[PDB]
Amino acid sequence: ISGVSPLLYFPPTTTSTTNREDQINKNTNIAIQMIKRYKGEVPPHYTRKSSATIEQVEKEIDALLGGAEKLRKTSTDDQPMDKLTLMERCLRHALWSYHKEEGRYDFDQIGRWVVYTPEDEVKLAQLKREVEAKEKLAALRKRREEEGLPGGPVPRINWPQEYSSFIDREPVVAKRIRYDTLASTTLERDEKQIES
C-alpha cells in the first residue's frame, strides 16, 4: 500500500440487482449441461413386461414374509442359513437398491439389507454424511436467508490489516473484489430440476 493511492475503495456492487432467481436459474442451466455430458446419452427406452408399482411390490413382499414368521429361526452369522432367510435377503436387497436409487434414505434399513462388503460400508458411510450435511446446510441457509445475511460464504478476514501488510494496492483491491462478489452472489441450484 506504499504511496498515496488515487481512489477510495467502494463495494463493487454496481449491479446489485443480481436477482437470486436468475443466478439460481443460470446455475441450473450450467449444472444440467455438465451432468448430461458426463453421463452421455439417455439410455435406450425399455418397455416393462409387467405393470406393478413399487409400493405394491413392497406390500406383496411383506405379505409373503409375514406368513413365514414362526417358520423362521434365529441363525448365527457363522451358521448356514434358512431358505426363508435367503428369500428375505434377496428381496430386501433388491427393494432397498431401488429405494436408494429413488431417493428414500432410511439409513438403518439400507444398512441392514444392502451392506455386505466393507467397500459397500464405506460407500454407505459417505452417503450418510452427504445427505445429512446437505440437509443441515439448507437449514443454515434458511435461517441465514431469514436474517438477510449474504447467502454466499464470507471469509474471516480483516482487510484493514491486509492493506497494512501489502506493498502494492492492486492485488489487495482484487482480493476484495473477488470475495465481495462471492458473498454478493448466490450458490444454490433449483434441485427440483436437478433431480428431474
Binding site: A125, Q126, R129, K136, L140
Partner: protein
C-alpha cells in the same frame, strides 16, 4: 486462557501449598467455562463439584447445557477438519 490460569493456580494451591480448594473456587471456574462458551470443560468441572464439593449451582449447569445446545444445532459441535473422512494415504503428516 482464563481457565488454564485458574486451574494452574489451583494446582499450585493444593499441591505446592497443601490447601484444599473450597466451593467458592470451583464456582468461579464453572462461571468462566460458562462465560467463555467452553461447554465441555463445564461438564468436567460439574462432576468435580459433584464429587469433591456438594453438587453444582444449578443455574450454571443449566447454562452450560444451554451453551452446548447452541453449537449442537449450529454444526459446530466438533471442529469439522476432525470429522473429515480420511484414509491411509489421505492424511497430510506435517
Amino acid at each position: 486462557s482464563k481457565f488454564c490460569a485458574m486451574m494452574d493456580l489451583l494446582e499450585e494451591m493444593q499441591h505446592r501449598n497443601r490447601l484444599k480448594p473450597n466451593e467458592e473456587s470451583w464456582t468461579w471456574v464453572m462461571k468462566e467455562c460458562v462465560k467463555s462458551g467452553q461447554f465441555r470443560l463445564g461438564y468436567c468441572i460439574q462432576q468435580v463439584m459433584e464429587t469433591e464439593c456438594k453438587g453444582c449451582p444449578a443455574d450454571l449447569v443449566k447454562a452450560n447445557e444451554a451453551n452446548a445446545q447452541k453449537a449442537k444445532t449450529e454444526g459446530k459441535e466438533h471442529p469439522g477438519h476432525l470429522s473429515q473422512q480420511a484414509g491411509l494415504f489421505d492424511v497430510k503428516v506435517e
